[PDB]
Design an enzyme around this catalytic site. Structure first.
Site, PDB file in Angstrom:
ATOM      1  N   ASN A 205       0.702  -1.149  -0.060  1.00 59.28           N
ATOM      2  CA  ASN A 205      -0.092   0.007   0.460  1.00 59.28           C
ATOM      3  C   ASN A 205       1.220   1.499  -0.304  1.00 59.28           C
ATOM      4  O   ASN A 205       0.754   2.164   0.941  1.00 59.28           O
ATOM      5  CB  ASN A 205      -0.846   0.275   1.498  1.00 59.28           C
ATOM      6  CG  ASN A 205      -1.615   1.242   1.800  1.00 59.28           C
ATOM      7  OD1 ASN A 205      -2.722   1.255   0.383  1.00 59.28           O
ATOM      8  ND2 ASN A 205      -1.756   1.467   1.909  1.00 59.28           N
ATOM      9  N   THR A 247       3.023   2.592   2.964  1.00 59.66           N
ATOM     10  CA  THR A 247       3.063   1.338   3.724  1.00 59.66           C
ATOM     11  C   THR A 247       3.021   0.074   3.550  1.00 59.66           C
ATOM     12  O   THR A 247       2.296  -0.143   2.515  1.00 59.66           O
ATOM     13  CB  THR A 247       1.639   1.199   4.387  1.00 59.66           C
ATOM     14  OG1 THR A 247       1.938   2.465   5.936  1.00 59.66           O
ATOM     15  CG2 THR A 247       2.784   0.080   5.782  1.00 59.66           C
ATOM     16  N   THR A 248       4.288  -0.507   3.259  1.00 60.95           N
ATOM     17  CA  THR A 248       3.838  -2.147   2.726  1.00 60.95           C
ATOM     18  C   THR A 248       4.610  -3.351   3.941  1.00 60.95           C
ATOM     19  O   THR A 248       5.480  -2.897   4.391  1.00 60.95           O
ATOM     20  CB  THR A 248       5.273  -2.025   1.264  1.00 60.95           C
ATOM     21  OG1 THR A 248       4.980  -1.351   0.431  1.00 60.95           O
ATOM     22  CG2 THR A 248       5.285  -3.910   1.269  1.00 60.95           C
ATOM     23  N   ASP A 286       5.152   6.074   5.095  1.00 58.07           N
ATOM     24  CA  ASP A 286       4.604   4.409   5.147  1.00 58.07           C
ATOM     25  C   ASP A 286       5.338   3.973   6.486  1.00 58.07           C
ATOM     26  O   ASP A 286       6.421   4.777   7.608  1.00 58.07           O
ATOM     27  CB  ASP A 286       5.925   4.527   4.162  1.00 58.07           C
ATOM     28  CG  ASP A 286       5.905   4.233   2.520  1.00 58.07           C
ATOM     29  OD1 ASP A 286       6.838   4.568   1.651  1.00 58.07           O
ATOM     30  OD2 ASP A 286       5.136   4.301   2.675  1.00 58.07           O
TER      31      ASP A 286
END
Ligand code: NA
Ligand code: NA
Lengths: 335, 331
Positions: A205, A247-248, A286
């Site tokens: 994301n 964000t991931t 993030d």
């Protein structure tokens, strides 16, 4: 050669004022996504459940034996629960901080399965991480305890639903401006090399965009005025020239034994490598969090040599290999 | 000093949450501490069926926070640099669920708005309190909800209340472990306010300012508590060869770097009142929270010295407030 769909999937603006969980009679749906990845990694199961009413979901990696874990968190928006160095499950979910609740559903269910035994050695450890997926939909429905429990219950050995499934249901990329943000998905990839197994799971994301191995931006920052995606740095430099004038969440699971120090550096290495497929990455906006998990099944040789070089078989080499599995997972999520 | 409160040996096989229709109880503890700190509210709830509970510090405006976690047994959710609540609970990692109850209720209170700036942020930490009782009931979502609903300004229930219901100290051997409780203390100095909340479930023991061990490691055979180092050093001579969760809330503006260093300072200071502390067995976690209402002076001087008014000074004073809270928990 992962065939990313060129077509835009713009998330679009959210309609505000949307209702939350109790406005719905929420039935967990087992997520099947666009395609199932089948992989051979006994001891590792994946469940994905979603609520259509979000849409939002949770994806659970269940490792009933428990597995040593390193956590690498980066950026200014990390949403993490547990972050344990040993886990029975990893829970990745939407709903921002509220979605950490799904991990509590998993924990409670695991406790019940253990017939409420609570010995220190029997504690069921779940680490959870979240993405903020509210801008990609109207509602305030989030992954709750029931949805985490459902994702655990739906867990199947050796299957992963690609695409819009579980935590990936409302994931999105490319956030210089929301008008150019596209829905991603979740993704997984698996490699077996000899007896070595590497599974990568990712829910990107990102603020940044997904970039393929040729350097092409393939998901995120789609400008509907040009019909193309360019790298965010073009927008950022033009923005500066204009306005400042003169964000991931992811996991890598492997069966190769690594000490805590080796595992943590492996985690950092693989997570850094993701700035190849996601750009920018590890930004202040993030909450990028990678879990590196080893099921401790096979040893590296005691010396690192091979015909391919004196320093060729070690955890760094594993990290290089795992970094490519992770890039493939990121591309499946964006496909 | 005080009468023993030995935990006694756990009985295994006890019932969990699914066996009961669990009724939250508002925790009142042994007495109420009253203080004046506008914008801060505390609620505590327990299940008698445990007994176990959760204690929630609610700061509805949200407040800048530093987290200092130490030891090998940390159980933490969120750990955010800005929080609307801090949730402390029993039930080991299962009790982090109480924080989710608080988060979900705060979302309902915000009418389900989910803008990034409106996210309701709850950091939660837990103690393992299963050895101190004979059930597996843990603080669940409904209990964290209840603790938030019970939160009021200016009150804290001391002793066996909230997260402190089944807290205990002094774990060289379970036969000598004693029930602690939760504790709080408050000081106001000029306009400066400092509130300390603590739930000591230490491997170590609680020690007062004289160096007396006052709770934990009580030997029924002798009637006396011992500092663990006496047991450890004899154990080594013989055989080789043959968690505390806490918050400090203040109203003094501190930068993130100042706040973080303040957290570490106050947290280390707790090794005066809890010994050993910050061990591999412990999941010690301190939250330093500031409501950012009062500036420190630009220069640090006073009649008491050239370097007398700064964050380190605040750190030293807060360290004392926290010691007092620890002692209240052990009383
Ligand atoms: Na294993
Ligand atoms: Na129940």
């Amino acid at each position: 050669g992962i065939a990313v769909d060129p077509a835009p999937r713009l998330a679009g603006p959210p309609v505000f004022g949307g209702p939350g969980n109790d406005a719905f009679d929420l039935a967990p749906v087992r997520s099947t996504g666009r395609e199932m990845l089948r992989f051979d990694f006994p001891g590792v199961s994946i469940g994905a459940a979603h609520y259509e009413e979000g849409p939002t979901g949770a994806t659970v990696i269940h490792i009933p034996a428990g597995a040593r874990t390193a956590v690498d968190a980066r950026g200014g928006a990390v949403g993490l629960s547990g972050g344990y160095d040993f886990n029975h499950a990893i829970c990745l979910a939407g709903g921002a901080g509220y979605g950490l609740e799904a991990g509590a559903g998993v924990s409670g269910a695991l406790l019940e399965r253990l017939e409420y035994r609570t010995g220190f050695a029997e504690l069921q450890l779940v680490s959870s991480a979240v993405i903020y997926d509210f801008s990609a939909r109207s509602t305030a429905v989030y992954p709750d305890k029931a949805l985490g429990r459902a994702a655990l219950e739906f867990a199947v050995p050796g299957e992963f639903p690609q695409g819009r499934a579980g935590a990936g249901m409302s994931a999105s990329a490319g956030k210089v401006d929301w008008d150019r943000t596209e829905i991603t998905g979740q993704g997984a990839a698996f490699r077996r090399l000899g007896d070595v197994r590497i599974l990568a799971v990712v829910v990107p994301n990102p603020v940044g965009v997904i970039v393929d191995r040729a350097g092409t931006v393939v998901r995120g920052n789609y400008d509907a005025q040009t019909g193309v995606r360019r790298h965010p740095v073009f927008d950022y430099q033009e923005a500066f020239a204009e306005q400042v004038p003169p964000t991931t969440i992811s996991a890598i699971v492997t069966n190769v034994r690594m000490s805590p120090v080796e595992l943590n550096q492996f985690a950092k290495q693989v997570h850094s490598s993701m700035h190849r497929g996601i750009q920018p990455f590890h930004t202040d906006m993030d909450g990028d969090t990678l879990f590196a998990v080893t099921t401790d099944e096979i040893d590296l040789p005691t010396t690192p040599g091979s015909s391919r070089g004196r320093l060729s078989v070690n955890a760094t080499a594993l990290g290089a290999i795992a970094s490519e599995v992770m890039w493939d997972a990121v591309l499946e999520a964006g496909k």
